[PDB]
Amino acid sequence: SGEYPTVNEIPVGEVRLYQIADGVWSHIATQSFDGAVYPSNGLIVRDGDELLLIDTAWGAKNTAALLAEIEKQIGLPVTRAVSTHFHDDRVGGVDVLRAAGVATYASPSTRRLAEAEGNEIPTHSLEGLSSSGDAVRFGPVELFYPGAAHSTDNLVVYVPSANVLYGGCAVHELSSTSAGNVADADLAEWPTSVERIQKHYPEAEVVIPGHGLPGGLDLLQHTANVVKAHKN
Numbered sequence: 001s002g003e004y005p006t007v008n009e010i011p012v013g014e015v016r017l018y019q020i021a022d023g024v025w026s027h028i029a030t031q032s033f034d035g036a037v038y039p040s041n042g043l044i045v046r047d048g049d050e051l052l053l054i055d056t057a058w059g060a061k062n063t064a065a066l067l068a069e070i071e072k073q074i075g076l077p078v079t080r081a082v083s084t085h086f087h088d089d090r091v092g093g094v095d096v097l098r099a100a101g102v103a104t105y106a107s108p109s110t111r112r113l114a115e116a117e118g119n120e121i122p123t124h125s126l127e128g129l130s131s132s133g134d135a136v137r138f139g140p141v142e143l144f145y146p147g148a149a150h151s152t153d154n155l156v157v158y159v160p161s162a163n164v165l166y167g168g169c170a171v172h173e174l175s176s177t178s179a180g181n182v183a184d185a186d187l188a189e190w191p192t193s194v195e196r197i198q199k200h201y202p203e204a205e206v207v208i209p210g211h212g213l214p215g216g217l218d219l220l221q222h223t224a225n226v227v228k229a230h231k232n
């Protein structure tokens with residue numbers, strides 16, 4: 001009823017959308033992994049009379065449900081998708097998207113890691129993102145590679161029309177005491193990568209983490225704090 005959705009308000013196997021700004025939504029789904037249930041976010045950005053999708057809904061069935069929820073709530077076709085790193089909460093569902101006619105994209109680093117680890121593989125490579133601080137335009141967003149953080153390949157996404165910063169899993173929610181799933185992380189570089197985000201997007205008004213509730217710019221400093229404390 002208007003609050004940001006959590007696992008407790010998403011019916012089993014379903015997806016919810018949340019309006020972030022004009023022409024910007026997040027998508028929220030839930031998935032089980034190693035015997036625990038987690039929420040995860042993605043982004044939808046209006047691209048004229050089409051939509052750009054950022055990240056899958058963490059699984060094939062969740063991603064089919066995402067497409068159906070978009071059709072119900074928005075009614076414009078998803079034509080392209082970008083996955084912001086190689087983990088299943090970002091690429092699981094790419095096969096569903098590709099068979100629905102969505103063109104799927106990721107950096108070459110993400111594509112290599114997905115292939116090596118047995119995750120679904122976006123079709124198209126995003127060049128121009130291989131050095132920290134790199135940025136490229138992609139429809140109504142800017143894609144930015146901040147450096148290694150949650151993963152070595154993680155990208156962030158900025159919506160300049162709305163000053164929305166989608167940090168993906170490199171950014172944690174304010175209520176998080178934990179640095180999340182750090183299996184593939186670089187804890188030593190993560191604060192430096194967050195500092196690059198902070199420097200590049202000082203006018204961000206909304207910051208969306210890969211999991212949990214959006215907030216403001218404080219999510220960036222909070223993330224650096226929790227990662228340093230985890231490392232400590």
Ligand SMILES: C[C@@H](c1cccc2c(-c3ccc4c(c3)CNC4=O)c(C(=O)O)[nH]c12)N1C[C@]2(C[C@@H](CN)C2)OC1=O
Nearest residue numbers: 033038087088089169176178179180181183184210211
């Ligand atoms: C698919 C993804 C994954 C699976 C399960 C939970 C999470 C979390 C995560 C978020 C937030 C909280 C926690 C956990 C705990 N409390 C939190 O608030 C994150 C994140 O932090 O983004 N991601 C997760 N995977 C798998 C894996 C392990 C690797 C193969 N051995 C691949 O790494 C990874 O991220």
Ligand SMILES: [Zn+2]
Nearest residue numbers: 085087150169
């Ligand atoms: Zn991840």
Ligand SMILES: [Zn+2]
Nearest residue numbers: 089169210211
């Ligand atoms: Zn994640």
